[PDB]
Design brief:
This is part of a larger assembly, with 9 protein chains of 8 kinds. Chain D is 24% helix and 21% strand. Chain D has 105 residues and is α+β, with helices and mostly antiparallel strands. Chain D has a 3-stranded antiparallel beta sheet, with no helix packed on it. Chain H has a 7-stranded parallel beta sheet, with helices on both faces. In chain H, β10, α12 and β11 form a beta-alpha-beta unit. The structure holds 2 RNA strands. Chain C: It is found in: Endoplasmic reticulum membrane.
RNA sequence: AAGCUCCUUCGACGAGUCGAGUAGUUUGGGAAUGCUGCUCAAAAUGGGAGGUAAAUUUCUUCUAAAGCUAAAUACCGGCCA
RNA sequence: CUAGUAACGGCGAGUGAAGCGGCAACAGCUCAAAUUUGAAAGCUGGCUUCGGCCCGCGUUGUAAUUUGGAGAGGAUGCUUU
């Protein structure tokens, strides 16, 4: 299950800073001499929690080793509800 | 007559101008300051960017003057702006 | 200065005024 | 002093003023008690004294003043704690009906 | 008494069908990125100036 | 919303999960030094609402101080002395605030948010360059932190007549003899 | 029991009820 | 007469001219003169005969004549039993006083109570209210209503039926009485309507009965229709019906104006021409669209049950009833006839849900014959992927769908025939899927004694 | 009493400081379920289940310090017991 | 980028902290005047403080437990005059 | 000024404020609590021909928006850089 999930998520990895700067240069040059919405793996505790509350998340993958554990304790129950 | 008996009726002369006031023998300095405040000043009209102008020009070259279709078009209006906004920008661009 | 304070001062600065006698 | 005199008395502490005077009745229902002696202070100066029968019985409110408690070294007397006392009442207490219900309470 | 009792799901047993928020979605969640528009404009100014 | 979920979880302190976490942690802190640096804050919600930012220049320092009394009672708080000791260790920093993390029966544990005033990020950012200013040296020693204000009674009302705007300054103002020129 | 065509089908106490001294309503517990 | 001979203000006369009304109806003819004279009036009138203008003219006339401002207060209050009726009166109000300087507002059940409180505190001179929310505001929110000069009650029979007797009794008690002009309209004259008249109207009111005693009664000659479909495919039925019988005449009755506008613009995107008629359109263009549909041989038009009431239905091949009727009785008896009119022969259809079989039970009781219509899961079209894409992509469709869904849920919850159309049996996931949502939007469905406790004997409460 | 025309003032959000936040209630209930109960709350639950309502209220008053606090704690715990029963 | 306006949409506000008990100290101030120590330890149409005998605890007035901020004020010390 | 008043005191020695009112001076604001999520947009270094290049910090949250006599979001039409 971990391998299959990570295969899909690697298909949907976000972009590196070098890649984003490279794209921005592409459009800057194109303007110097109309796109579809990006799809990305959402990360960030507050962002993911808000997505769960507003029921836009289709899948949640939660790390098992967070240092102040309180930051993820409510997450399984929240997802269940 | 105060039909409703409201005190602010003998006081009159829901949006108001927010940046100025529509305001309506004697000392030299007072007259000088009054004429200095009343002197007519230039306004420096704001321009539209070249990309904004070409955007509006493409909109008009495709649809003409039908602002409903210009607003509903997704290819030429990526930002899903309203017909009233597009019409205002056309008028301020000077091409109806 | 903060950007919000900069905007507030840009759009609503201290104006010159005189009051008659 | 009154609670020391009363051997069938449960002493309780401060009662919320923003609460309800019948929230007092269910408080008395907690301690299986059919009589309530309620002390209510106003401005921290003036006492008000309530005598009540908790379930349905009548209640009476008095304004309490002129208070010289014990522990005052001019009484020269003392008595047993909890002994059954002799209750002395008045002809007015027997004649006026409101004084009669006060006497019963 | 049970020193370590099992948890009874008295609240998460009921699945709610609606988001917690009734707030409206902003326009920017449906239109392209104004921030990248601004960044690309800054880059175009830099390219034009050399 | 995780911050608010943690706020409620920290409101419930004798709950089973919070109690287990607090026990295991008091063991950890007691095995560590009396004053030692924290990287991540243990209660991120409390740190955020007290003013902690994940910037370069913000540090946490956790401290344990012995509890009890001197029958005499110390007028400043155990939190105040913990703040003062943390600042004395990190003399080059400014004590922004502190918060409670654990109690124990022998000690009391606090985490102190400290800000570096000589850091370029802190100096560039407003809303913290005020603590970069030099009038804010050793706020914990002068009683200018939240504990200091609580102990000094800096509240408005008729119950704080003697203590607002300075107890000793008010005493001097009331016990000074004013003699005008034309009496 | 659908009597009329399109109208709706028409559909503890710890106290007893007595009268007050002022001709009012009284609850006896 | 007409409208000019009557001495009205120039602003209101020009506004009516822009609306496009020239010759008045009977209720207007007999109701405007005494209302402007100031006489308290009761009217036995039908809905759709022009009574909306008949009572909205004098209120605006007097508000403009004695110069209200938002700081003055509340002014004229008209109370109506249905959300869609409130919306119709509000649209008529905007189109009537688009030139005046007064303010108009609608406060209805199911809406945002805090937003309505803000509206009322800001100030509305022409308030249009549903009785329950109106009473809640008059008891709880702080707003100025001391300068209340005009009170209008619309469809008191429908109000007292729903069940707002106690509520109305408190509105007339709270609202001020001195120099107040009241305008009470009803279709029936029951004892409750009489009690209202006595409690509200001043002694000796002026009566206007523009009703017709020769009312035609229905017989065993009514044939009705039912298509039992799940909640998540009602729009798929509507789309398949319309696209297949594009060449016939179809009139579709919805529940709410927001639903009408959402489906109109959505069907524009999904590329099938439909004519539109709701409360947000101008009266002139609404009349033009109705006229062109009535004269055109083929087409499909969508409107609300209230519009169906207020308009004269032409000869039409298929009357589709999509959302549950406001007044169930009238649909099974009145509009069933309108379907078969003149020398022609029309057909009827009630979209029905597996949670609403009590409707079929009520029909057996009413002994009117009914024919069901199977639909082949093969001939159902599937445009759900395109629908979800459009709703998730275009922002305007998103708001339209949200408003239509909210209005549909509110109407379903506030429907009178609760035993049949109870909201708690709906599946909100399926309803939102039909409207085009992968997840349902957030909506509010709803919108022993103390020991020793004794009754409420006086005090300084407020 | 100087007769002055009273004015209707607008609603104040500071006066609206009363908490009717549905999301806050949701968060509180979920955190209650996740975290569990204190030892004194567990004793109150035991008393509430075995029927010693008066003992539960008195114990809650002793632990908290106010009759209203005891009443609200007992009501919260009783509704928790009812929710647990229904969920089972 | 910004101010206003309007509304069939929303509107998150600080916990070992309040509070109860107790000891010390302090204040003109046992509704504890404030502070600190120890035990127990909260709420959400909530909480704090006042008014009220007026019939129940009605009414009034503010939002604590995060933070910044010049001037009017002190000044036997510093640079002077 | 209130005022040696209220208040606490063997109602000893005594202790001892504050609201109002006149004046001086006046100035208001920042965070935590919301998802930028159609794009961490933020920032520390050190390499520089100075124009921009990389190391990193940071999603356990750095920018922008907002701080409850508020505000957000849409719409709308004027007004300001």
């Amino acid at each position: 299950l971990a391998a299959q999930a990570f295969k899909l998520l690697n298909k949907y990895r976000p972009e590196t800073k070098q890649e984003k700067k490279e794209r921005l240069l592409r459009e800057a040059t194109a303007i110097k001499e109309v796109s579809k919405k990006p799809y990305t793996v959402k990360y960030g505790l507050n962002h993911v929690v808000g997505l769960i509350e507003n029921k836009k998340a289709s899948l949640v993958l939660i790390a098992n080793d967070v240092d102040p554990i309180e930051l993820v304790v409510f997450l399984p129950a929240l997802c269940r509800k | 007559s105060e039909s409703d008996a409201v005190p602010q009726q003998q006081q009159q002369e829901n949006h108001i101008r927010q940046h100025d006031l529509e305001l309506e023998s004697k000392p030299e300095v007072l007259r000088a300051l009054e004429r200095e405040a009343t002197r007519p000043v230039e306004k420096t009209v704001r321009h539209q960017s070249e990309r904004e102008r070409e955007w509006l020009q493409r909109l008009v070259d495709k649809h003409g003057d039908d602002v409903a279709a210009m607003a509903r078009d997704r290819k030429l209006n990526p930002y899903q702006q309203t017909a009233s906004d597009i019409k205002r920008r056309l008028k301020k661009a000077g091409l109806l | 200065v903060l950007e919000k304070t900069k905007k507030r001062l840009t759009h609503f600065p201290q104006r010159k005024y005189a009051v008659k006698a | 002093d009154l609670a020391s005199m009363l051997p069938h008395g449960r002493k309780d502490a401060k009662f919320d003023t923003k609460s309800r005077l019948y929230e007092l009745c269910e408080l008395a229902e907690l301690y299986n008690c059919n009589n309530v002696l309620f002390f209510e202070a106003r401005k921290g100066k003036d006492l008000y004294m309530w005598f009540s029968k908790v379930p349905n019985g009548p209640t009476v409110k008095f304004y309490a003043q002129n208070l010289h408690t014990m522990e005052e070294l001019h009484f020269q007397g003392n008595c047993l704690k909890g002994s059954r006392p002799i209750l002395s009442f008045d002809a007015a207490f027997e004649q006026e009906p409101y004084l009669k219900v006060i006497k019963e309470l | 008494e049970d020193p370590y009792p099992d948890t009874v799901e008295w609240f998460t047993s009921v699945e709610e069908k609606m988001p917690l928020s009734a707030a409206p979605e902003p326009k920017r969640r449906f239109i392209p990125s104004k921030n990248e528009a601004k960044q690309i404009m800054k880059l175009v100014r830099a390219i034009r100036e050399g | 919303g995780a911050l608010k979920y943690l706020e409620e979880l920290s409101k419930k302190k004798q709950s089973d999960v919070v109690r287990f976490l607090l026990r295991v942690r008091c063991w950890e802190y007691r095995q560590l030094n009396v004053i030692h640096r924290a990287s991540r804050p243990s209660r991120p919600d409390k740190a955020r609402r007290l003013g902690y930012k994940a910037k370069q220049g913000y540090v946490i320092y956790r401290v344990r101080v012995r509890r009890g009394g001197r029958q005499l009672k110390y007028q400043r708080s155990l939190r105040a002395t913990a703040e003062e000791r943390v600042g004395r260790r990190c003399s080059n920093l400014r004590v922004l605030n502190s918060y409670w993390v654990n109690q124990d029966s022998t000690y009391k544990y606090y985490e102190v948010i400290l800000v570096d005033p000589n850091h370029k990020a802190i100096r560039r950012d407003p809303r913290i360059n005020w603590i970069c200013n030099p009038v804010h040296k050793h706020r914990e020693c002068r009683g200018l932190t939240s504990t200091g204000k609580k102990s000094r009674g800096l509240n408005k009302g008729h119950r704080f007549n003697k203590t607002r705007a300075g107890r000793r300054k008010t005493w001097k103002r009331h016990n000074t003899l004013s003699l005008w020129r034309y009496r | 029991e659908i009597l009329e065509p399109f109208v709706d089908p028409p559909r503890d106490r710890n106290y007893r009820i007595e009268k007050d001294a002022n001709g009012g309503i009284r609850y006896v517990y | 007469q007409e409208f000019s001979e009557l001495n009205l203000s120039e602003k209101t006369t020009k506004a009516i001219a822009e609306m496009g009304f020239t010759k008045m109806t009977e209720i207007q003819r007999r109701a405007i003169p005494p209302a402007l004279a100031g006489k308290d009036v009761l009217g036995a009138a039908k809905t759709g005969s022009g009574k909306t203008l008949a009572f909205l003219i004098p209120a605006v006339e007097m508000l403009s004549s004695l110069r209200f401002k938002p700081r003055n207060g509340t002014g004229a209050i008209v109370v109506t039993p249905t959300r869609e009726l409130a919306l119709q009166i509000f649209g008529v109000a905007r189109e009537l006083m688009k030139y005046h300087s007064q303010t108009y507002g609608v406060v209805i059940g199911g809406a945002n109570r805090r937003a309505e409180a803000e509206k009322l505190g800001k100030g509305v001179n022409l308030l249009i209210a549903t009785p329950g929310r109106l009473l809640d505001h008059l008891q709880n929110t702080p707003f100025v209503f001391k300068n209340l000069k005009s009170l209008i009650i619309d469809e008191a029979d429908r109000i007292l039926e729903i069940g707002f007797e106690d509520e109305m009794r408190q509105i007339v008690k709270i609202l001020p009485k001195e120099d107040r002009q009241t305008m009470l309209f009803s279709a029936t004259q029951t004892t409750k309507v009489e009690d209202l008249a006595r409690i509200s109207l001043r002694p000796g009111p002026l009566y206007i009965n523009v009703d017709e005693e020769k009312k035609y009664s229905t017989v065993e000659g009514l044939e009705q229709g039912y298509v039992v479909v799940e909640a998540d495919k009602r729009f798929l039925l509507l789309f398949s019906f319309l696209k297949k019988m594009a060449k016939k005449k179809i009139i579709v009755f919805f529940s709410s104006c927001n639903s009408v506008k959402y489906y109109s613009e959505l069907l524009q995107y999904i590329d099938l021409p439909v004519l539109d008629l709701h409360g947000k359109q101008k009266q002139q263009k609404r009349t033009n669209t109705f006229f062109e549909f009535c004269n055109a041989k083929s087409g499909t038009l969508i409107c609300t049950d209230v519009a169906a009431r207020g308009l004269d239905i032409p000869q039409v091949d298929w009357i589709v009833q999509f959302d549950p009727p406001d007044d169930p009785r009238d649909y099974i008896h009145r509009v069933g006839r309108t379907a078969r009119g003149n020398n022609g022969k029309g057909r009827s259809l009630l979209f029905l849900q597996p949670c609403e079989l009590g409707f079929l039970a009520h029909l057996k009781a009413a002994k009117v014959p009914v024919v069901e219509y199977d639909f082949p899961k093969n001939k159902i079209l599937n445009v759900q992927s395109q629908l979800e894409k459009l709703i998730s992509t275009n922002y305007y469709l998103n708001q339209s769908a949200k408003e239509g869904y909210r209005s549909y849920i509110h109407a379903y919850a506030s429907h009178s025939l609760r035993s049949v159309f109870d909201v708690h049996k709906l599946d909100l996931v399926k309803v939102a899927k039909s409207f085009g949502f992968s997840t349902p939007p957030r909506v509010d469905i709803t919108l022993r004694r103390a020991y020793g406790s004794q009754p409420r004997q006086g005090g300084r409460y407020k | 009493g100087h007769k002055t025309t009273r004015r209707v003032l607008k609603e104040r959000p500071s006066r609206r400081k009363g908490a009717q936040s549905k999301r806050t209630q949701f968060v509180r209930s979920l955190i209650r379920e996740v975290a569990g109960l204190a030892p004194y709350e567990r004793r109150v639950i035991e008393l509430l289940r075995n029927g010693k309502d008066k003992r539960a209220r008195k114990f809650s008053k002793k632990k908290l310090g106010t009759f209203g606090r005891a009443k609200r704690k007992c009501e919260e715990l009783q509704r928790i017991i009812a929710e647990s029963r229904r969920a089972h």
